[PDB]
Structures are given as structure tokens and as C-alpha cells.
Symmetry: none
Subunit: 40 residues, 2 copies
Amino acid sequence: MGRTHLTMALTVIAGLVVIFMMLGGTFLYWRGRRHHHHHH
Amino acid sequence: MGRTHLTMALTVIAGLVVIFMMLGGTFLYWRGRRHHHHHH
């Protein structure tokens, strides 16, 4: 192992980030969306 | 013999995880705790 372990490690890091970002942007967006029935 | 970049990398991974977990457990917990609508 040396440079190949970067593939797995990279996926883990990216996975978490995408979750925190997606979840945050999704939750906040969803909440606001339902908040107002009219168009933005 | 050789482990330095693991420190920084470890922090990043742990940081994200803690966020996804804390945020999720906090948000869900908060919502359930005070399900009552907001007044502000």
C-alpha cells in the first residue's frame, strides 16, 4: 500500500462531505420550500 | 515506519463523520423534542 490506498480513502472523505453538503442543502431547501407555497 | 499525513487526514475524516452524526442526531432530536411549531 502507498498510492492505491488513496482511492478508498478518497471515496470515504468525499462520501462524508457530499452527505453533509447534500443533507444540509436538502434539509434547508426542503424546509423553506414547504414554508412558502408561492414561487420564489 | 512512517505515519504523519495520517494525522491531518484522520482529523478531516473524523470531522466530517462527527458532523453528519451530530447534525443528524441533533436535528432529529431537536425536531422531536419541540415538535410544536415555532413562534418567531
